[PDB]
């Protein structure tokens, strides 16, 4: 038993393959179960609906992303900026190398219409993103106390931009992965953003 | 006659209202015709399919955006950077003020699945975006000859970032228009990007 945990991820797996083939709107828990080899009744057992199953793919892919950090932070102990550095290098380059996030993120951006009850997973993310604005603000406030970024840095915008710069490059590369290379140009792109924090005026307003 | 041009845009009109209500995937030319008060045979008259009708809403909304320019350029004659300036100020703030682009852009980003024959309008945009990478590169090369930006500016990355920064903020504000204010914070946000062109190293590689 708990070979159901073998089966539980199996439904998540075959959802990605399908949500990439056709999108979320053109897919019911019907063809997922039919593809999972498990009954249409056994699928409505793990999950309530399509919303909190697709919320599951967003959730169960536990935010590693943000669970390396403390172990990235082990390598660079008292340097906060060098961790805000390599965490973003990771989020960009994992969209290239890691399949279980390659497709996952392509669906979030390009293969899911945020309407058909999918408007409620929009709020479950609208709110999750708002915590992110100030899971970053604090990392920046930390950076200002090790003094690696300016004292008068506009921290919310330094975060709204971060989000808008990082995922904007993600959205654009997922639409056309042929147009540019994210696995190579990332180190620079992210260093551009940290230099944007360091050198750019208009991200200040003194005293 | 040409009161068909009254009716032609009428089909485009009621498409926006519907594509915002439900998405593009859950909408046929059937309920657009039904809603246009025109026959389902008369809708398949102006338009071949859903692809080149949704390409039409993208196309017929002729790229003003980029047709102010030469008349924005009339105000600022020999200054290339002050035009690259106010054109982006317009693309951001019109996502707020103008409804016939408010909805249009929310669909492009959040309410359209790029799969079911919508994968072909993806290439029609993948290619349209690639011309945009170097409709900007030239505006930047121009800026380097009035000398308003650095001589060693990486022009492709100055354009890939531009696209990824400008539309990234668009994508993010359309998902949660409550999280920040684009009609006010834009002037600065865009000035940040132009200061990124001016001040930021790693966007260079000398000689």
Can you describe what's shown?
- The structure is a homodimer of 207-residue chains.
- In chain A, α6 (81-97) packs antiparallel against α10 (182-199) and α7 (99-110) packs across α9.
- Chain A has ten helices and no strands.
- Chain A has helices at 4-21, 29-36, 40-46, 51-59, 69-72, 81-97, 99-110, 120-145, 157-175, 182-199.
- Helix content of chain A is 67%, strand content 0%.
- The first copy, chain A, has one domain: Orthogonal Bundle (Tetracycline Repressor, domain 2), CATH 1.10.357.10.
The coarse overall form of chain A would be elongated
Name of the CATH homologous superfamily of chain A: Tetracycline Repressor, domain 2
Strand tally of chain A, please? 0
**Strand-pairing-aware structural class of chain A:** mainly alpha
First-to-last CA distance of chain A: 62 Å
**Most extensive interface: pair and counts?**
A-B, 48 and 50 residues
The oligomeric status of these chains comes to: homodimer
Helices of chain A, by number, come to 10
Write the SSE topology.
Two copies of one chain form a homodimer.
Chain A: H1 4-21, H2 29-36, H3 40-46, H4 51-59, H5 69-72, H6 81-97, H7 99-110, H8 120-145, H9 157-175, H10 182-199
Task: Provide tags for this entry.
10 helices; homodimer; 207 residues; Tetracycline Repressor, domain 2; mainly alpha; 0% strand
């Amino acid at each position: 038993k708990q070979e159901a945990q073998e089966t539980r991820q199996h439904i998540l797996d075959v959802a990605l393959r399908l949500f990439s083939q056709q999108g979320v709107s053109s897919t019911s828990l019907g063809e997922i179960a039919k593809a999972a080899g498990v009954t249409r009744g056994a699928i409505y057992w793990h999950f309530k609906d399509k919303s909190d199953l697709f919320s599951e793919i967003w959730e169960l892919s536990e935010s590693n992303i943000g669970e390396l950090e403390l172990e990235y932070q082990a390598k660079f102990p008292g340097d906060p900026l060098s961790v805000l550095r390599e965490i973003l290098i990771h989020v960009l380059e994992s969209t290239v190398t890691e399949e279980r996030r390659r497709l996952l993120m392509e669906i979030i951006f390009h293969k899911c219409e945020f309407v058909g009850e999918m408007a409620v997973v929009q709020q479950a993310q609208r709110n999750l993103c708002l915590e992110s604005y100030d899971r970053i603000e604090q990392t920046l406030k930390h950076c200002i106390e090790a003094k690696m970024l300016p004292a008068d840095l506009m921290t919310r915008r330094a975060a709204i931009i971060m989000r808008g710069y990082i995922s904007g490059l993600m959205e654009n590369w997922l639409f056309a992965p042929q147009s540019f290379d994210l696995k190579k140009e990332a180190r620079d792109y992210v260093a551009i953003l940290l230099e944007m924090y360091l050198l750019c005026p208009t991200l200040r307003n003194p005293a």
